[PDB]
Design a protein around this ligand. Structure first.
Ligand SMILES: NC(=O)C1=CN([C@@H]2O[C@H](COP(=O)(O)OP(=O)(O)OC[C@H]3O[C@@H](n4cnc5c(N)ncnc54)[C@H](OP(=O)(O)O)[C@@H]3O)[C@@H](O)[C@H]2O)C=CC1
Ligand SMILES: NC(=O)C1=CN([C@@H]2O[C@H](COP(=O)(O)OP(=O)(O)OC[C@H]3O[C@@H](n4cnc5c(N)ncnc54)[C@H](OP(=O)(O)O)[C@@H]3O)[C@@H](O)[C@H]2O)C=CC1
Ligand SMILES: NC(=O)C1=CN([C@@H]2O[C@H](COP(=O)(O)OP(=O)(O)OC[C@H]3O[C@@H](n4cnc5c(N)ncnc54)[C@H](OP(=O)(O)O)[C@@H]3O)[C@@H](O)[C@H]2O)C=CC1
Ligand SMILES: NC(=O)C1=CN([C@@H]2O[C@H](COP(=O)(O)OP(=O)(O)OC[C@H]3O[C@@H](n4cnc5c(N)ncnc54)[C@H](OP(=O)(O)O)[C@@H]3O)[C@@H](O)[C@H]2O)C=CC1
Ligand SMILES: Oc1cc(Cl)ccc1Oc1ccc(Cl)cc1Cl
Ligand SMILES: Oc1cc(Cl)ccc1Oc1ccc(Cl)cc1Cl
Ligand SMILES: Oc1cc(Cl)ccc1Oc1ccc(Cl)cc1Cl
Ligand SMILES: Oc1cc(Cl)ccc1Oc1ccc(Cl)cc1Cl
Lengths: 249, 248, 251, 248
């Protein structure tokens, strides 16, 4: 058969566009979501027009038992997996002094713990045909301060560190692991930020490139990192931000 | 007089940090999870230096135990000036063998602890116009150490939390940083199946020509809480004899 | 002015630069080959590229001299009338212990490895404006940010090269010029013969790279090709490390 | 009595560092290129602290003048324990306006100088048990500062040379590191056509709620030469009030 790709959180936004790009390149697709079922089924219908097979799996990736159920479905339906894009994220955006334990656990479980358990199940499927590629999506708040972003920034720093440990430990399985970090993108996720207009204004005005990052720019780097043209890039996080992080003022 | 808490100060780096702060006149809170005998021995040594000591058993992996410990500090000393986040644990095995409990145990003790300890520290620090927070990290936050995934991932989280705390606690005049060490010959190395490899690497490959010692880590902590480092914020200072520079 | 896009690669008579130029030619770019002394190698290279059905200009220019750079870009404007891609690849160096370094060793290395990018980028930007933009990619190594034995002159020059990459990436952005770099681990090429510890570098790369093999010229060229492709237009002032995971390790 | 050299110590950070070391008991070598009166005033101030001072005119962009200066230090004091590479100059212009003379000027003074000065320092230090070398850098080494290309590129070269020197001088018992600052309101800042924007950005956006002062740079230099920083090697410590953490 043909190669298969899973993209977590692919009902909308970056994940959806990544799943479509992989489908355009001949991959069968696993679409994943937590609650936005209608958008997930609509994405699946769009992608099936390309002549690939699509499996839609509801699985909150913050719960390893749901991860394991999802991968059992992938194994039953396709019997293989070749590309895995860890893209889903959630979070609680408030000042650090107001954070509660549930806010930390929710965010860390979905955004960083997910990669460890998805990577384990992905590797077991990838070993069947000789390897594969894993790419995670991160942001500038892993290494810099974004206002109100503590829970998510800390999870993304864990995610990038996990990307390094997996990149070393899964190399014997011929699995290539890396991450792509973005500057701000005008998706539904920005609506979580009470300072949404400030972020957009800053991206529009202060990005050296002269425009904001778009979903296509993140997808283009994902595509490269799964393409076989990037097999000796390992454990790296590539920053796609139009040059915004280079500045001071 | 000012008061300092060091989590995990029954032995190793934390014990030495607490002793150094006592030598500097700070009253001390010693904290442990199970090593009570060692914690009381440490408290006895520190009272010889002429400061007061409070010993608190509190597993920092549990926010409720954290809150209890800072309630005792408020009742005993009524203030806090220095907080060193030093306690760590972990499960050291290959990534494919890790289970959810191994992740939760490690992330709760090593990284979640700083969040809840920092919130409680800040509440006490702002009573007297501020304070300093320093956390202890290692080269595995940014590089690969064998079987160290749970711990390395938690130290990367801790350094990122250090950056977020350093910005958001600045209005309270609290100065927050971290110190990352190369390998040190403490009881922690007993957790590693490759202990002898780590020591031999540190001995032979460190440019300085010797291993990092506890004293080197404490020297940087002492600098970071001294008032001479108040415009260093959110930084992780690497103390490794130059080991991480090499790319053999 | 040429109808098809045109690319310059400095130091393209052999090694990574030669391979990058052949790759760009395979993708339809007309090519400027550049060398300082290896004229025969540069001419054989151009002959292989002409068989791909693109035009090739061969220019001798020591890129450690800004005057020779200006002459080179004057030849490119005269022959092709445009430049769309510029890959700053040439390097030289003096490999010895830091205590044995003399001023001439520093000047030679900095001039060819780092100063070259500034003046080549200025001249490239002037040509790139004829068609509204372009891409500049420089080649660096792990010695920019780490210690590599005997590599002080070159490592310091590559750190300068990577900082110049960031400054150019910001300041050339209004001209729609995208500037980045690619940093490699060790590759079995003619350049390893410059190292008195060549065997130790090879043993290390072969034994300690997580990928289980050494970087090859092809892996460098694959990244170059991506960074000039239009798929990387919002990557700016970054250095992408291509080392099989080697730099991740400690022990 | 140990001896310390600080390049460019007629005014600004270099002057304050020389004063601080003199307060700590070091004999001092003051260095300048053109500000003779200022250098002489500085020496007079320092002589009042009870230490010996040597004033040496040497343009550090010229390795022959560097060699001459260290011969004078050897003859006068017979030793050197601390060397602070602080002198800098530059040409602040957009990248398209830069000429080869602007590059050579800036690179010779800011980066070439550390190589040759560290070579001569090491020959003196290794004769007497070793020493410390600290260079001063800025955020422009790793970030973009407007018009700062020549200086930012030279400072990236300086931080790389700091790494290479840290490794290769370790067998001589010489500890080499760097300190990178945010903006400071010194005479150097008047070379910037956007000085007012740098000052406003530093005052408004630094999380600490104030600008870095000369004293904060000096405090870190003092640490990095002190014995308490002997296992910090080839690191650049950022002193910027947390400014570099932000995006916006
Ligand atoms: N937008 C931006 O500016 C930037 C985004 N990022 C990263 O890009 C990635 C995608 O974000 P973006 O596309 O903007 O966000 P969107 O809100 O558009 O999409 C998020 C996707 O994640 C899914 N998801 C959320 N939680 C879970 C969960 N527990 N389990 C399974 N799926 C889940 C959502 O599905 P559902 O509705 O069912 O929850 C949705 O499909 C994230 O990792 C984000 O951190 C990085 C840099 C910048
Ligand atoms: N040793 C090394 O090579 C290096 C260590 N580090 C870091 O240094 C720090 C100290 O390690 P080190 O001194 O070597 O180790 P030690 O084993 O000597 O000391 C660990 C201390 O932490 C305490 N501790 C462990 N878990 C908890 C918990 N849940 N709650 C409260 N206290 C706890 C221990 O007490 P108890 O016995 O009661 O559990 C002990 O007092 C750690 O953060 C480690 O990550 C960093 C780099 C290198
Ligand atoms: N080989 C490796 O392990 C690695 C190499 N790199 C980098 O890759 C790049 C290419 O190296 P590599 O292909 O291995 O080296 P090679 O020796 O194979 O080729 C070097 C090329 O540079 C040219 N060159 C040297 N000096 C000048 C000059 N002054 N003016 C114009 N051309 C000049 C040479 O031509 P001529 O003979 O006429 O002088 C030759 O064409 C360099 O930037 C290097 O730092 C990076 C990481 C690893
Ligand atoms: N001010 C700031 O915001 C920041 C400064 N820095 C760094 O701090 C260091 C000191 O700068 P700062 O104190 O602000 O500047 P000042 O202008 O106050 O002092 C500069 C000193 O350098 C000397 N100097 C300049 N060129 C030479 C030369 N060729 N040979 C010998 N001495 C020379 C000057 O003496 P003379 O008059 O005789 O030439 C003078 O004593 C520099 O490395 C700078 O890059 C870093 C971050 C921020
Ligand atoms: O990580 C991100 C970073 C930025 Cl700058 C913008 C959006 C991002 O993505 C998220 C942020 C918060 C939540 Cl609740 C969910 C998502 Cl997807
Ligand atoms: O973090 C560390 C890094 C290193 Cl190189 C050596 C020891 C370390 O500390 C620990 C490692 C594992 C566990 Cl279980 C507990 C501790 Cl205190
Ligand atoms: O930069 C490099 C880094 C490595 Cl690991 C290997 C080779 C390199 O390339 C050079 C090294 C020295 C000189 Cl003189 C010339 C060149 Cl092309
Ligand atoms: O390096 C610096 C960085 C900053 Cl933010 C401010 C001043 C600096 O120092 C200089 C900058 C330019 C010149 Cl001509 C001379 C010097 Cl001393």
């Amino acid at each position: 058969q043909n190669k298969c790709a899973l993209v977590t959180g692919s009902s909308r936004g970056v994940g959806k566009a990544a799943a479509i790009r992989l489908a355009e390149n001949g991959y069968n697709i696993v679409i994943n979501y937590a609650r936005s079922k209608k958008a997930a089924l609509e994405t699946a219908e769009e992608i099936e027009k390309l002549g690939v097979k699509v499996l839609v799996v509801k699985a909150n990736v913050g719960q390893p038992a749901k991860i394991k159920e999802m991968f059992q479905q992938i194994d039953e339906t396709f019997g293989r997996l070749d590309v895995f894009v860890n893209n889903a994220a959630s979070g609680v955006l408030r000042p650090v002094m107001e954070l509660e334990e549930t806010h930390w656990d929710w965010t860390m479980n979905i955004n960083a713990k997910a990669l460890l358990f998805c990577a384990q199940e992905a590797a077991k499927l990838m070993e069947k045909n000789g390897g594969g590629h894993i790419v995670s999506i991160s942001s500038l708040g892993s290494i810099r301060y974004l206002e109100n972003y503590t829970t998510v920034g800390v999870s993304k720093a864990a995610l990038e560190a996990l990307t390094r440990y997996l990149a070393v430990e899964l190399s014997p399985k011929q699995i290539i692991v890396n991450a792509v970090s973005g500057g701000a993108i005008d998706t539904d996720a920005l609506k979580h930020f009470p300072n949404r207009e400030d972020l957009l204004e800053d991206a529009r005005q202060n990005t050296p490139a002269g425009r904001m990052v778009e979903i296509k720019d993140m997808v283009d780097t994902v595509e490269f990192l799964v393409s076989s043209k990037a097999d000796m890039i390992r454990g790296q996080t590539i920053i796609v931000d139009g040059g915004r992080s280079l500045l001071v003022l």
